[PDB]
C-alpha cells in the first residue's frame, strides 16, 4: 500500500533503528559513575588519578570503560536534576577524614564531618538511588592519623569512647557512614581508605563495579 518513497522512508527509519540498537548495546557495556561529596573532600584528587555544568571523565581500566560525572559545579537545586542519574552503575562519595575537627567556612557552627554525613544520608536514602550501590572513599587518611594524635575524635562524635588510634578512629567513622544506610538489603556500600598518594583507588573501583555488574547480571538473568 506504501508508495515508492514511502517504502524508502520506512527503510531509512529501520536503518536509524539499527544504529540506535547498536548505540544502546555499546552504552550498556559502559560504567556510569556519579561523583559526589562535600567541598575539599578529595574529589579533585580522584579525578586526577583516574584521568560548563557537568564534568565528564572517560577512562578504560582492564577492558572496562568508565564514565565519571562530576556535578560539583551545579549550584542549583539538587532535587531538580538528581533524578537524571537514576540508573548509574554506582555512586562514588568522597569524605575527608581529616575534616572531623573542622567547621564549615560559611556556617562556622556545623562540623564538616556532620555536613558530609548529612549529605551522605540525603544521597544514600534518596528515592532515586534506592538500589544504587555507593563507593565510599575516605580520603586524607595520612593527615587524619597526624590529627588524631593531638585532636581527639570525641570533638566530632561525643558518644565515641574508643582508643585514640587511627586503626580504631577510622573504623568508627566508617561505621557512622554505613549506619546511615536506611536500606541495608537493596544496596551495599563499598568503603575504601584512599590517600593523597594512594595508587590503588582505581583498582578498588574496578572491583566494586565488578560486584555491581555481577549483581545486575543476576537480576537480569532472573536468579536474583
Amino acid at each position: 500500500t506504501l508508495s515508492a518513497e514511502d517504502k524508502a522512508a520506512v527503510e531509512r527509519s529501520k536503518m536509524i533503528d539499527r544504529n540506535l540498537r547498536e548505540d544502546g548495546e555499546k552504552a550498556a557495556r559502559e560504567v556510569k559513575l556519579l561523583l559526589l561529596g562535600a567541598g575539599e573532600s578529595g574529589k579533585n584528587t580522584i579525578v586526577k588519578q583516574m584521568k560548563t555544568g557537568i564534568v565528564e571523565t572517560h577512562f578504560t581500566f582492564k577492558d572496562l570503560h568508565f564514565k565519571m560525572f562530576d556535578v560539583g559545579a551545579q549550584r542549583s537545586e539538587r532535587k531538580k536534576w538528581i533524578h537524571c542519574f537514576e540508573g548509574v552503575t554506582a555512586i562514588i562519595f568522597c569524605v575527608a577524614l581529616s575534616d572531623y575537627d573542622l567547621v564549615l567556612a560559611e556556617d562556622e557552627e556545623m562540623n564538616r564531618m556532620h555536613a558530609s554525613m548529612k549529605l551522605f544520608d540525603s544521597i544514600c536514602n534518596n528515592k532515586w538511588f534506592t538500589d544504587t550501590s555507593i563507593i565510599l572513599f575516605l580520603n586524607k587518611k595520612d593527615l587524619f592519623e597526624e590529627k588524631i594524635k593531638k585532636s581527639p575524635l570525641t570533638i566530632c562524635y561525643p558518644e565515641y569512647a574508643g582508643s585514640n588510634t587511627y586503626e580504631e578512629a577510622a573504623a568508627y567513622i566508617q561505621c557512622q557512614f554505613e549506619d546511615l544506610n536506611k536500606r541495608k538489603d537493596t544496596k551495599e556500600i563499598y568503603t575504601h581508605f584512599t590517600c593523597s598518594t594512594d595508587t590503588k583507588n582505581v583498582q578498588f573501583v574496578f572491583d566494586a563495579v565488578t560486584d555491581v555488574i555481577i549483581k545486575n547480571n543476576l537480576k537480569d538473568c532472573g536468579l536474583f
Binding site: 514511502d6 522512508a9 520506512v10 531509512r12 527509519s13 536509524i16 533503528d17 544504529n19 540506535l20 548505540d23
Partner: peptide, 12 residues
C-alpha cells in the same frame, strides 16, 4: 513522523 511512526532523524 507521527503519521507513520517513521524516524526522520536521530541526532546524537
Amino acid at each position: 513522523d507521527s503519521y507513520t511512526t517513521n524516524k526522520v532523524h536521530a541526532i546524537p
